[PDB]
Structure 1
Amino acid sequence: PREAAAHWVPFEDKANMPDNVPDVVEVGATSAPLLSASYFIGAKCKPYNDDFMLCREESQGSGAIDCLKEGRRVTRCAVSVIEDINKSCLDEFRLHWQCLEQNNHQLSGCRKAEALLNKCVFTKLNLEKKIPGLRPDEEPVFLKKDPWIKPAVDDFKSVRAYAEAKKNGTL
């Protein structure tokens, strides 16, 4: 919760899970693919994530050990979403997070690639990108036309793919 100062030295641990708890395979996506598919991880895995944090609230202070069985399932369902999005939308998911690794991982600067990614994932994986807590009479930010905050330079691959999706009639 506080960060290490004044000569911290890092250390790691040559050990294993005990036999009591089964194997769980991990998430291997880094920040730009994780930030790219964050809304679709949240759209599919909402009741699993909320049961995990509700576990953590319910049995206070035990925490780690009494919530492992649902921390299993949140990781497995997010892995399901990520390979689902790989095998359907690999090239434009890659287009999106390759836009996102420039521009400080700001979602504000990658609108023309995220329109393509949202259209693919919505027609093929049937998951929708939504911002909750947003009452009506309020436009969502990634839908608006001519925003005030444009990026410095639009990425070339995504504006080329965006124009070709215009002329195909994809989007």
Structure 2
Amino acid sequence: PREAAAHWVPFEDKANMPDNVPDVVEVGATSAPLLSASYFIGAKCKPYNDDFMLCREESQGSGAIDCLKEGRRVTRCAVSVIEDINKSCLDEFRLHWQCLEQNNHQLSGCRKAEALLNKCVFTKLNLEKKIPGLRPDEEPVFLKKDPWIKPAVDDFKSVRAYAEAKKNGTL
């Protein structure tokens, strides 16, 4: 849809959900860690997200009231992902999303921390980043060795960690 125009007062609703709709926890994670975790979530919640959008399509207008179960399963899959991250790969996740916040959420400025995060989650949770729709020929941009576009300032903590990890062989 469109945005508000010419005037608009926010207004909430202090009511509760109907008793026939059970209760579900919320993701509660903000823009940056969520954007970091997007790929790991999509690698794990693919069938659930697809089933959600399919039941929205089949309903043909009543999607807001017929797809609640599917959206609930999606939310739970997401929470399991982020809980696995915070339990296991916390500091690397923090490096990534803070490196992002000190940019415009351009992923190009955070490749080192992204590398450490992909490595750790692939070794522990067995979840890898993948950009689909590409041919075997095209080289995905997060694995290019010497990209054209580089950040204005490589983050400090990320750089120290990347160097120490090459020295330790973890990468």
TM more than 0.5: yes
Gaps spanning 5+ residues in structure 1: where?
Answer: none
Q: How does 1:111-150 map to 2 (within 5 A)?
A: 111-150=111-150
TM-score of the aligned structures, taking structure 1 as reference length: 0.99
Gaps spanning 5+ residues in structure 2: where?
Answer: none
In 2, the alpha carbon distance for the partners of 1:169 and 1:93 equals: 20
Residue aligning to 2:58: 58
Runs of 4+ in 1 over 3 A off after TM superposition: none
In 1, the alpha carbon distance for the partners of 2:69 and 2:44 equals: 19
Q: Deviations over 1:78-102 (max 9, x none)?
A: 0000001111100101110010111
Q: Deviations over 1:124-152 (max 9, x none)?
A: 11001000101111011100111000010
Q: Deviations over 1:14-71 (max 9, x none)?
A: 1100100100000010000000000001000000000000000111011100111101
| Secondary structure of 2:119's aligned partner | helix
In 1, the alpha carbon distance for the partners of 2:35 and 2:157 equals: 19
In 1, the alpha carbon distance for the partners of 2:169 and 2:149 equals: 27
In 1, the alpha carbon distance for the partners of 2:113 and 2:63 equals: 40
Q: Deviations over 1:110-167 (max 9, x none)?
A: 0011000000000011001000101111011100111000010000000000000011
CA RMSD across the alignment: 0.5
Alignment length (residue pairs): 171
Task: Give me the identity figure in percent.
Answer: 100
In 1, the alpha carbon distance for the partners of 2:167 and 2:96 equals: 20
In 2, the alpha carbon distance for the partners of 1:111 and 1:69 equals: 36
In 2, the alpha carbon distance for the partners of 1:40 and 1:103 equals: 21
| Secondary structure of 2:67's aligned partner | helix
In 1, the alpha carbon distance for the partners of 2:133 and 2:73 equals: 26
In 2, the alpha carbon distance for the partners of 1:11 and 1:33 equals: 28
Q: Tell me by how many angstroms 1:5 deviates.
A: 1.5
| Secondary structure of 1:121's aligned partner | helix
